Symmetry: C2
Subunit: 321 residues, 2 copies
Amino acid sequence: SLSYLTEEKLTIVGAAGMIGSNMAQTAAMMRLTPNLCLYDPFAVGLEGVAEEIRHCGFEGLNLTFTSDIKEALTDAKYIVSSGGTREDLLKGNAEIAAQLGKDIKSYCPDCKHVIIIFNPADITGLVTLIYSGLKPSQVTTLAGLDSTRLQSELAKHFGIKQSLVTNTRTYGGHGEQMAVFASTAKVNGTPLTDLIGTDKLTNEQWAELKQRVVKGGANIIKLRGRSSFQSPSYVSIEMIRAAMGGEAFRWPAGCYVNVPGFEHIMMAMETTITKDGVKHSDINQLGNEAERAALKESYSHLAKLRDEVIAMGIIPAIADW
Amino acid sequence: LSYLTEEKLTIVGAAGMIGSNMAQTAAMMRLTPNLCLYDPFAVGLEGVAEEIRHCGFEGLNLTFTSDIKEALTDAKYIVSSGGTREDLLKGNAEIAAQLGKDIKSYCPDCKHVIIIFNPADITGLVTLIYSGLKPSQVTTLAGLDSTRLQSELAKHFGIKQSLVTNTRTYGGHGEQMAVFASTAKVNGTPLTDLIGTDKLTNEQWAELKQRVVKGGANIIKLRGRSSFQSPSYVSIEMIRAAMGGEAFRWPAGCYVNVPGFEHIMMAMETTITKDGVKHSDINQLGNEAERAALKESYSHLAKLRDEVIAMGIIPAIADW
């Protein structure tokens, strides 16, 4: 085995669930830290999860579990949370995200990085950042699944090994609000934009393929009988590994953006997460002009949702940030 | 790192909670790019393959299928969680026989097979017999009783789990497990010097053992379903060892046929390597009292074996 990447405490919030439990197993396999702490309000489900992890026999693991948030966040340096009417779910998740920020502020204001994966992640991630008191470089959201699903759907269409479709990228919002930057991708060396609208990938096939990405989460539900839990788990934990100084993470992440044309928002971006946190590349040089316009469209929907949550009084007036 | 091998690994029962976790673990471990997922429930299976594809494992060449011939063709490694009491026994015995027949037809050159559906002493043995393989090529998952005993002892003493060393149960599982306490140390101190003392009383040890025996029922009470992460994780650790990665030394179920313990598959002191499974000398295992406990477990396993012979599924021992 490799040595553990760090001794600092990693806390998983939402650990009793199908996603959080898989995260626990993934973090332990990756040997990120021996000090892995599992938090969930659901104490009985949590205990069953911890018992399962203990029975894997991970060498050197110091697993802890708790339903007390102070205990869970004390000494925490990394945190990953899956602990999540339309207005009611929106408000409900924005409120749990604010409370997570306040808790980070009270119990671990020196936290290094925090990843929020519960939806709607543009709001939850931004609310957590604001209430947590952390720098923008310290908070990201899971946003890479649109890109891995695009990669998969392209590899299936072309009947080739998935890894041969390189640099597939969506930016902005997710699902219906994703912005596909096809100019970034190659299919076994050939630019995707040379293939779209040819006999090898017709206009209509491309539309249908994009729609299978948009509906990718519904499709897992229809096939598995429950929401996806292994992919969001694994990808999120690869993200926190990068933030902890491990192997770099090679897919878009959600991060804070505030530049002319895209002000005061959290969006899926071309990011790199390292021990120094997250940074994003220059939006003005992303893709081509048409793709940037699609990104602006996605931006406009995100900005409307942000303003709803300001109106609920949860996110402060932008002028007050 | 680099993939451990290019040879094909097939997971049978891949649509389930255990199988799907096995798929992710095998991909994470980079055992082989050629990971093949089989299950007769094609819709459930596709959803698992989709999740795995959406993790983005570099270089993975995932396939899935509900066709046993396609799944077993070119397979060199196989892990299966593809499973009245007499009816559950027979049904599982019959699926274990069909798996053996299938291996013999489609991949008689398979290197190693791990059977994890219960009752593993019977399923493992039936698969071995029907598969045509050597005894060094078939194992069953049998280590959770040892890891549970490690965890329960560490919880007792309030120390880090890895500091409880060399905890071992042999023989059957759960109610039929045989605890070999003489093998274990608690942070350097022989377990047998702790049992019956102030630091672990007679009654606390009885209760601790029972928490191991009922470990599976406990996970069900707590999670609301049977364990799936630990059986998956430990089993793929075993196949990694068979594929030539880090050796696997928790107990595994394997074929034993020696005086006092004839014609049976039992959890043993085993090592799995690129050369398959070997077990140590039973007569040197633990002390005389513990070997007697192990003989009791053997007696129960032998009765079960003979029931499956009487069903005409396992041939007469004289015909092996």
